[PDB]
Structures are given as C-alpha cells and as structure tokens.
Amino acid sequence: SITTPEQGTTVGGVIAEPSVQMSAAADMATGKSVDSEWEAFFSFHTSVNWSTSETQGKILFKQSLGPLLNPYLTHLAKLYVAWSGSIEVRFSISGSGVFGGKLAAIVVPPGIEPIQSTSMLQYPHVLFDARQVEPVIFTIPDLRSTLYHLMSDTDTTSLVIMIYNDLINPYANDSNSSGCIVTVETKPGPDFKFHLLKPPGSMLTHGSVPCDLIPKSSSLWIGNRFWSDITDFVIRPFVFQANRHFDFNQETAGWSTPRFRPITVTISQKEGEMLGIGVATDYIVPGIPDGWPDTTIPNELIPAGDYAITNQSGNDIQTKEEYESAMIISNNTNFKSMYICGSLQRAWGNKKVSNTAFITTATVKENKLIPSNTIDQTKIAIFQDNHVNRDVQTSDDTLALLGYTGIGEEAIGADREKVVRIGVLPEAGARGGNHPIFYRNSMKLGYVIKSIDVFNSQILHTSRQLSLNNYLLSPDSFAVYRIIDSNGSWFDIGIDSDGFSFVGVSSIGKLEFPLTASYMGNQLAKIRLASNIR
Amino acid sequence: SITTPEQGTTVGGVIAEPSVQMSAAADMATGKSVDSEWEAFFSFHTSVNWSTSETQGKILFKQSLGPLLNPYLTHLAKLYVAWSGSIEVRFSISGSGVFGGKLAAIVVPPGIEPIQSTSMLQYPHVLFDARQVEPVIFTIPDLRSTLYHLMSDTDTTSLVIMIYNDLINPYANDSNSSGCIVTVETKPGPDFKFHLLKPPGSMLTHGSVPCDLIPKSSSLWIGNRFWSDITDFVIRPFVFQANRHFDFNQETAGWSTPRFRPITVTISQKEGEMLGIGVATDYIVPGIPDGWPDTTIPNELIPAGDYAITNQSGNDIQTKEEYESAMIISNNTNFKSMYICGSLQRAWGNKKVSNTAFITTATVKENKLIPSNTIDQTKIAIFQDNHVNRDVQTSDDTLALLGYTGIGEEAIGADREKVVRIGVLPEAGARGGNHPIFYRNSMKLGYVIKSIDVFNSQILHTSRQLSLNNYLLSPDSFAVYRIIDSNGSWFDIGIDSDGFSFVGVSSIGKLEFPLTASYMGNQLAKIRLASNIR
Amino acid sequence: SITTPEQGTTVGGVIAEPSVQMSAAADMATGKSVDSEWEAFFSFHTSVNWSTSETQGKILFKQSLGPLLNPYLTHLAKLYVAWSGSIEVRFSISGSGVFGGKLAAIVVPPGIEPIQSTSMLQYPHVLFDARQVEPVIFTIPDLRSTLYHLMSDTDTTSLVIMIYNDLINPYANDSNSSGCIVTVETKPGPDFKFHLLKPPGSMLTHGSVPCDLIPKSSSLWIGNRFWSDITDFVIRPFVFQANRHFDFNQETAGWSTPRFRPITVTISQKEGEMLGIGVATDYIVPGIPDGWPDTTIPNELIPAGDYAITNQSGNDIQTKEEYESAMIISNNTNFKSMYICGSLQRAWGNKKVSNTAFITTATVKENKLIPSNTIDQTKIAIFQDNHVNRDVQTSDDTLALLGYTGIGEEAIGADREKVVRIGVLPEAGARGGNHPIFYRNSMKLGYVIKSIDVFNSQILHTSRQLSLNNYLLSPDSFAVYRIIDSNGSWFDIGIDSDGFSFVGVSSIGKLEFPLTASYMGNQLAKIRLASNIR
C-alpha cells in the first residue's frame, strides 16, 4: 500500500547483474586509499605578502575555521547541514636565504579576536624563521560549545599569523624595498566529517557565507550607476546613493532593476516643442521609469539654447578652474547636467526622423524645467523636435544612457543636492576608524572629445547577487575581501550591512589596474583594515 | 534547624479520619487512567485542500518542531522553559479508489528552509498514495545542537509535504475539476519530555514567540494612526509612518502611547486673533503632545475663510478628481488638510462655550501658517475663541479627533512630503518578492457630508504589544500570519524586523469581510507568502 | 476499516536513524526526575501579620479547598473539569523564644462559613505555639457530596486559623507593641488527582469563578459612567445606576455597550433655531443611542444665554456652597447641568465649521427644555449651527464627551431624581453590615477653569466582563476582593448578585494611590469585610 523510502519490485535488468570484480576489481587501476582522497594532502587556501615594512605585531592572516578553508571541503558543504572535526594545516614561506625574520602562528579559541600586539603572542605558538625550508604542519582542533556547527556559525576556532620578528634585508635605499610571499595549505582533519545533509537548492535559514560577492578579478567589474567598468577608487567622508542599489535585506533602495536595459517610455505630444514626460511603459515602480539616472539639474533653466559650450575649443587640456580668464565661458553650455540618449524616435501619427534624447529628472513647466531631489510619477524628462499636429499619443519611446553634459570636474552625483531621491537616500558614516568608499567610473561627454567621471556605490555583480541570495551577516560586521594588483599593493574592503564598502586607508591612486580579489570571511566593524600602499 | 521544600512535621486532617481512599470510587466516575492521557491520543492540527489543478511539487505543511504544534503541549509548555524529544504526526487523506496520485514526505533538518521547487525531492523521501485509507503516522525526530531547547528556539528540525505526482481524475474537463482534503493530527512523541520548571512570574531573559500579534478575528483591529477599524488593504511599494509606530526592539520613531485618548494642551491666549503653538501638559515626548495627529498642510496656507467653499453641495458624487469642471471645484476652502476635532475650551479667567478646534503642525509666524515637516515643541497650531484685549492668556484645555478637510481622494499618509517625522523616517521597501501594505481605514469629513479614508501602518493591537512586550525575530524572517475571508480566499502577512506588514501577491482584491487571522511563525523574507485569493 | 485516536500505521523518522536515546544526555542537563515535580515541593500562598494587639479569637485564613489555592494546580486545572482529593498546607511562623501565644487550627466542613467569634473553638482543634520553629504541615481532606468536584464548586471543605491565645510580649507599653508574620505554603495532596479532560475551546455549561473581575492594579481601572480612571471611593447608603451597568446574569438595565466611543446621531435641521431630538444611527437600544450620557437637567431651564455667568472668575476658590455671597454666585448660567462635548457637524447640503454641542436628555416642546426622567427616542436634545431657512434638514453627525456645567460640588449621580432610568431603577441598599460604594472619578468643567468629579458604579473593566462572560454566584455571597495601598492599609470589596460594590467599614479615608487588588472568592454577605485601614 505505502512506499518506504527505498524498496520495491527489484529485478536488476536484462542480462544485468553488476557482479563485482568488474567493479570493485576495476579499482586495481588506481591504488585508491579509501572513499576520501580528501584527507591525504593539502591545497592552497591562499597566500599572503610579507614586506620589509610592517612592524612586529600586525597580524597577516586571521582566518576562521569552517569548511571555507580547504576547497574540496568547501565544494562539498554545498550538500550538507553542518560539519565537525579539525583541519590539519601546513604552511611555509617562500623567501630567500638573504632575508631575515621570524613569524609565528597561533590557534585562537572560539569567542575571541586577536590583537595586533606582541603580548598576544604569549600563547602556544609555532615559530617559522624566514630561512625555514621544510614547511610545518599543525592542527586546528574543533573546540566547540555545541555538538556541531552548521555552515554559517561565526564563533569558530580561528587561526592566525602575525609578525614575530620584523623582516629585514641588508639592502635599504629604496621605499617599500620588497619582501617575500607566504602560503597556507589546508588538509581536512582526520577527525573531520560532515553530518546531516541538505536537500538540493534549499535556503539556509540562517544566511549563507557572504564570501562570494564581487568578481575574483577586476577586469569585468563595472559599476551600478553606469555600465562602464570600474576605472579607479575614490574615498570620501560620506557616501550616498540608492538607484542601482540593494541591501542585505534586499530592500529596494531605488527603483531600477539589478541590471541595465534600454529605457523605453511612451509619451504625449505636448503640441508645443519640447514635449511632456511622465509615462513609464516597462517599469516596476508606479510611474518612476526604472533606468533613470540619479542625476538632475542643479540650476533651474530653459531647454532652449543651441550652441553654448565654453568658447572655440581645440585648446584642449587648458587647465581651467576659473578665476579668471575671459574667452572660454567655461561651464554653462546653455543646458548642462543633461542625459544624452540614443533615442529611437516617435511614430504613431507618422512622419518624423529620430534625433532627440536629452533628459533629466525635474518637472514640466512649458519652457522652464526647474529641478527637484524628489522623483515622482510626473518628474521624468525628455527633449524633442517632433512638430505638433492634432496631438497624437503612443510614442516610439526608448533611448539609452549614453552621454552627460560637460559641466566640470564634478564626478556625477558627487552631492546630495544632485541625488534623485525616491523616498530615502541611504548614506554611510565612517565606522570604527575605517572610511566609506566609492567606485570611480568613466562616462562619455557630449561637447568635448572624451571626459568626466562618475561615482558608483557598488559593483554591478554586487547589486546583482545582493538582490537574489541571502547571506546572514551581523549588524556591526563587515565583509573581508582582499583586493590586489601586481606591484604588491594589497588592502581590504569590508562590506556594510547596508550595501556599502569600507576601507582603512588614508589615500591610494597609482596601481597596476589589472587586479584580482578574494574574501577572508568577515570581521567586526570597529577594527580597521590594514593594507599596503607606497 | 533548616528544612527542604517538602520536609516538615505533618499532622494529618482533623475530621479527615478518613482523609484517605475516598477517590477510591471517584476514580470510577471518569474511568481515567494515566494522568497524561493527552500524551497518548491524537490531536488535530490542520488540514489542507489538495486540488487536482495543483502542479507537481508544491509545499503543503511547512510545519516545524516545537511544542507550539500540539495545543495541549503548547499550553503545558507555559510552565517550563525546556523541551526536547520528537513529536509524532498522524495524518491522512480520504482518497477514492478512482483517484491516483502520490504525496511526498520529507524531514528537513534545522537551519534550512524548504523551497516550493521540485529539487526538494532529490532528497530521501517517503512516497505516499491517495488511495491508502490507512492514515500514516511517523515522527519528526529532534536533532539538536544544544542539550535542551530554549522555549523560543525557532530553529529546529522540521517536516514537510509536497505533491510528488499530480492528482489525476478520470473525468477531467473544465473548472477546478475537484480535489479532496487532507488532515493532520499530532501526538507528543514518547521521547518528548520537558525539563526546566520556571517559577511563576519570573521574567524570561529572551522573548516569546511573535505568533501572538494580530488578534485572531477581523472585528477588533482598528488603525494605529486613527481609531477606526480597518476595512481594506493597500498594496504599495513603499511604506512610511512614525507616529504611534513601534519597532521590534520596543523602540519607536514615534511620539505617542499606543492608544487613542483626548489631547490636552495649554495655549497662551494671543489676545489678538487665532494663535496655535501651545505646549502639551503631560506627555512622554518633551513638547510634542502624545496623541497629536500625523501630517501637515501641503502648502503655505493662511487661517481664515468662514465656510470656505470647494463648491457644489447636493451635487453629490459629480465630485472627485480635479474639480471635474469650471463651476464645480475639488479643493481650496482655506484651512484645507486640517484635522477637525471637538474641543473643550479652558476659560483661564473667564468667557465660555468651547466652540471650535482645527489643528495641524506647522510654523505660525504672523497670521500665516507655513508647513514644517520637522516636528518640534514650536509647531502645534490651532483655532480659537480668544477674544477680549486685557490680553487674558493661557486659554483652552482639550480637544479630540473627529474629521479632516476633504482633500479629494487623498488617503492620508500616502506621501513622505506629507508625513511628519520627529527626526528619523521609519519605512520599508519591497523586501524580497514581497510587497508592503497599509490598512485602508476610514476618516469622516466635514464640509461635504461623510466620506474618504486613510491608510495605516500597524494594526493598533500590534503596536500595543510591541511596546508592552519583548520578542525575538531574525532580521530576515517575517512573522507568517494567515488571513482568511468567509469564502476560501486566504493569504499571508509578515512582520518586518522593524514592524511592517508584507504580502506575497502583486494585487489583492475584494473579499468577504467577516475576516479572521492566525499565526504560523517565521520564514525567510526571501520567500513569497503563498495565497489562495483572487 | 476504522481506527482509534492513536492507532495507525507508523513509519519512523527518515534521517531520525537515530530518532531515539538522544534525550539520554539531555536528561542530565536538568537532573529532573518526576515529570510532576510541582506535585512534590511547596509553593507559597500567602502570609499574615499577627499583631500582639490582636484580641483573642480572630480569623487569619478563611482559605478554602479547590485547585484555586496552589498556582500550579490552578493553572493546570485550566485543562480539566474535574478535581478531587485534598491539598496539604505547610506554614509556619518565626517566633522568638521570648514570645508566648498559641494559634488554633480548624477544619471547617463544607456548607458552613467560619465566624470571627470565639465559639468557633468549641470545636475539635489543633493548638499551635509561636515558639515552634518546626513548620506545621497538615492536610485539608476533601469530604464531598458528589463523586467528582465540578471546577466551579465553591462549596467545599475548608480550613482556618484563629488566635487561640493572645500574643504576649515581655516589654509591652505604648504603640502597636510588635507582632511577627506568618506564612503559608501549599502542595497538592497525594490523593489529589483531576479527572475530566476538557477539549480546548469547548464551552462549559456553567461559569468561571468570579475571582477575575477587578484588574490586579489600580492603574487601568476607569469609571463606567465616565472614561476617567478612578481616584477615590464613596462610602454611601444607597447606590443607583443603569447606564452601562450590568447584572450578573449578563442582563443590563442599561442602554450602552461597556465601552466609551464617540456618539453619532442624526438630527433633522429645525430651520428655526436650536432643535435637539435626533435619533441615533447604529445602536443596540432602539432609539436611545449607545453612549448617550446619564443624567438630565434638574429644572425646567431654557436654551440661551451666551457665556451665561455664575459669577466671578479669577475669584478662584472664594467659590463652593451656595454662591458664598451676594456679588459672588454659585449656579445659574442658563444651560447648567449640561454635558459638554466636541462635535463634528454633518453638512447635509452645505455650510461648515463644527462649532458647538451641549447635550442632555429631556422633552423639547418649543424653545423650552423641560426634563424628563424616563428615557425614550423622544428626548435627545442638543445645540447647533442650523441656520438658513430653505429648511435644509438632517444636520450633524458626531460628538464626544469632554465636560459638564459647574453645578457646584455635586458629584454627578448622587440623586435618583437626577439619574435617568430606561424603565427600571437598578440599585442596592446596605445588605448586611456592609455599605455600598461608588468610585469617585473626575469630570472636567468649562466656564470655570478645571474641577469637580463624578461617581461611578462599576469599575469599567468589570462591566466589560459581566457582559462578555457568564459566571455563578450565590445571591447571598459576595465576591471578596482585597485592596491594598502602598503602606499597609487594606480592605475588602464585594460584588452583589446584581453587580455592585460593598464595604465593611463605616468610613474609609485617604491612602497612597499606587493601589493594587486581588480576589478571594465568596463569603455570605451577612459577614463584614474586615480591613486594616484608617
């Protein structure tokens, strides 16, 4: 009548019989140890850089226990509920016999966070002189309050490596001379083994490991305010934005979708000239047309005024800044702060010829516009040259975010007075000692050859994944991601539970852009974020 | 000497001579056996309607472990703090030998939450047939991290049912063909026993289960911004309200006790004409009177105009929109968007008859009334019967709340620009695929006849609890609440870690109002709240 | 085939492999033994202060049998309907080897009620000394008429304690010499076991114990004739009140729901001047609006006089009595004894601004207003802003309640001639040596400044229950309720079979108002309610 898990009319199959030997005995071609090629060797969880700069104390690696360590264990957890057991570790430094410096590691018990101080060293540790050749293997025991910790669980028995004895070389002279590269290899403990398993494609009621956010490679980064990939990194006192912005609670900060699509909107022929905006065909916000930029106009002005720019132009790279030349009316371009789009055109009532595509987010008052930091149904903007008749409707909409209007050295959306708030503009005041950041981006200009920057709040892949999965992260806790280039410069970014990024540095600029990036888990918000620049 | 909680010198009844074997016969009266008869039989829990139009794979019992299941246990649990073991679950269906179909059974371990997808089945399961008249009874074994489960632990083992194979029926065709019901009973497992006996009155260090907010019954509900019972729902993309709104941590952006009572304020007789600006008398918010309304006038209007028009009465319902026509108008009447309210006049020195009251919150420089959005002890205006130039001062006493000024079809509290914040702006965007709601209430008007309503954020009774209690909820798990009309329609509502109402439908409609609710528990906001409405 | 409430085909957990002997260790976590630990230890019940000035023979524990004693039992009893057996009672005193005195113990059989006289002792008793450090523990054997005791049976075996021999102390003299305390614990007897298991939600054929009326706390109490919290007691010989007053059989002489909400009535615009006589809109009393005030004008007064005097303001407190002097007067002002109340005006056709409201209940023949005592849909007058002779009709909407007209120091509702009956006249005379009370509330006034109060019959929360519940009480046994201030003062209040409040003192006085109450049960009204007040 019923159907207990696995049972029922069994039969094998026609001339079917899996009769060992041919199976089992087909193992001969291997020499296999057990059903765990896992516990047998180690992998490369990661490698840290050690330079003649950092001073005796600063911790170099602060990893916490959990399958996230060894990759195969990692690649398996995607099938289980919780784990248990220790993890054998082997690490070694790849330095040169000309160097000099000791290093020690310690197994910090669950519940405490190390401190960049020598005293913290007094504890059963393992030295490792820079000259050491044969690597050293020790174990990370599973000291656990519970019977087993399931996937997440932050309070694991963490490991750590700090500078026991400053590393120096008998060759001073230059700046950040050099250093050596260290590496940590993990091996699944002999007493480690998972436990109950997960039902494929299920969601962990307590969030997943946030570590997976941004691309482990610069190249295909790109922002959210705009599609152009990240150009540089900029730091400021405060950071505000919302449109292509998402949060850990997946709160719709803005009104657009996690990606980029051609803004398409119908409109009515204002019977005048520059026509009436407001419709919003393909959008998930009553009115507010997903895709509209966070920028508007700063000074109320008329859409009328052809040919403005500065002066003649051609005398490019003419270090401006005003004060006080009289010839190149720097700034003004009649109607700046605009959004040039590749529009389709209208249609319906027929006869026409593309063009147009100059928008903003203000308000329609015949010949004037006048801004507003508040965006509602009837606030979008456009431009035209679709001569009036009987006044037909349903336009051929569409257009794409392409250009802006050469204001000045102002990186797009550099001020609150510019940000098109929808309801609540989420900012970000420094935490602990760290400072918020921004993602510099490029944006094509309109009158000039090529120019102007744009401030982005978060990488596209960030917003993307942030609006789908669910990663539980404490309130006052970050998200440790190590970014690096090629020269040797390395720092961290701790994502905020609000969707922002932080760093603990004063200023950086000149770096081999072809970067890379990983994640070292997540630490508190107060503690800073060491780094290496200059 | 001392003595334990039972020891002591006994004496035995006086005429209780005979203070023994009496219950001898009494025992027969009820032929009862084990003093734990409930720990034996089965109690009903819930049942669902399995329809033939229900596509393969679809959850039916997200039910989770915890004494909250069986009512007896749940009741008894009130006396302990510790529970452990499993709970048996007997349930079956009444299938006809004709039908065909199979149901699946799966024991989901703690920390994971079941998804309404198919993949769930690529997990060890137990098939189940519609014909089987024999009711199945298995157990949900308790796998635990700790030793004993704290009463509130909402993260435990769980069991679920999903439609393996559709429900087929030999006489298909049109409409919702058919579909039989399925019940589910419960009995405390054998190995289920409590543990810690709490002393009556002691206070628990954590917080009770949030499944006790909304009252099971539509009757007594009533808005939190206005004392009228709710009569509808508002499917919106954004929600905002601070006044009388409470957080989950018992905090409140608001400025008033979770109840509706008369507002008593003392205003200094201006001697000249109408004044306003009168500080409260006794409230838990320095200056800002507890109970003082919400929004403010949406324009720099002045205080005057007798029965200022808004034209055409008797011309009932030729109304709504933008004044409908030239002759007929939709809004002006000077003191528009004003909160009407009976009011008892003080008298100070002398002169009688209450007389007026028209209030709001804004700056009263001169005989003007510009609107302030930021609320401080300096923006509490009104209208009066001051009179006589001796400059007699400190007029009035109290005033209540009756109506407002007919601003068309504007369900009060639909725009940030109109809601008054004390400093912060409590709100919520569309978390997950879920949308935020309000509670379409009803607010009488004056000049007209009787009409228009207003939103609402928390069902009053809720806020009431929020402020008087202290619970525990995952900042990513709502508070599943079931709602059901008088037909069949039913949907779920959730509670934000902040305290808002959410829905899993893009639009809900008309339904018989003899409504009644219930409580399920908590589910990652990342999942939609299913519903059989529309 | 069929199946009993437990039978069925078992399946056993899925991964519950391991669905056994786990609680093995969990059991240790709390080293608990019998699942009925309460059926073992002793729980506190109450304790009293035995003073050396307490004359020979004086009751101290009228405590009676029934699971209402011990809290655990009392709680558990919520799940049954049947109880039997006895209850052990351990209690003792902390006497000093110096003191001398003896206490008596007597087991009073059912059907009799102990009197505070000496003769009680000419009954088999158990002497008890103050020195005995050993706490005594005897049992109150259950002698019963029936087989099993219905939950509500208030007539059972009982035990009591009386001061056999005064409390002597070698250092007598002045003041309340001294006196030690005495405690009393409770433990369910062995032979005590329940019997009938009630099904959750079923409704009991009788009624719960009346010890659940008054809220234990003075805070939320509030009068039933007026929504203000009580602040004093009135020792009177007679009491009368029908409006919002409920009987014990759930009947009510009244005409309004046990709650306070706005009063909505529709009055037909008289066209001439003020009118009145407006029938309600939606109330559970044909005509007579639910919520409409209580008394009526004590004289054939007319409707007129603006800020009609009652002379001298600023001449604060030179007031009270009979106008105090010629110049200074105490009462006239035309519409005296009128209920003030804010009110929202309808509008019908047109014309604005609420404006007035002054009501009561009487016949409105002509522009006069003679008082009727008998209330019918023909006596509901008011004051208005009718105006314009087109004879525009059916004016107003609602009005609340704020004040009344300063009729001197007349605590409203102190004379039959002033209270309005619907037909019957609910009241109560001094039953037994006990006297009836009221609940001195507080009602704001207008013309003056702020003052005067008004009585009250049932603490609102009471009536509330009365109407929504259904109990059982002997038409000769009150509902003993203990009241206590913040010092030591305490007295008892009773509930009449009709629903009134009684007291056993000839006069009560001032006492710290951080009051709180309790419930004892029932006692023949023929006995005085002792108290340690004054």
Side-chain angles (χ1 to χ4, degrees), chain B residues 6-13, chain C residues 42 88-90 126 132 134-139 187:
Chain B
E6 185 160 67
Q7 200 64 191
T9 171
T10 140
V11 182
Chain C
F42 268 102
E88 321 200 302
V89 178
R90 168 165 74 169
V126 177
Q132 297 179 226
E134 194 69 312
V136 67
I137 327 100
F138 35 43
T139 37
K187 158 194 176 193

Side-chain angles (χ1 to χ4, degrees), chain C residues 1-12:
Chain C
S1 5
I2 70 289
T3 168
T4 47
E6 185 160 67
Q7 200 64 191
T9 171
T10 140
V11 182

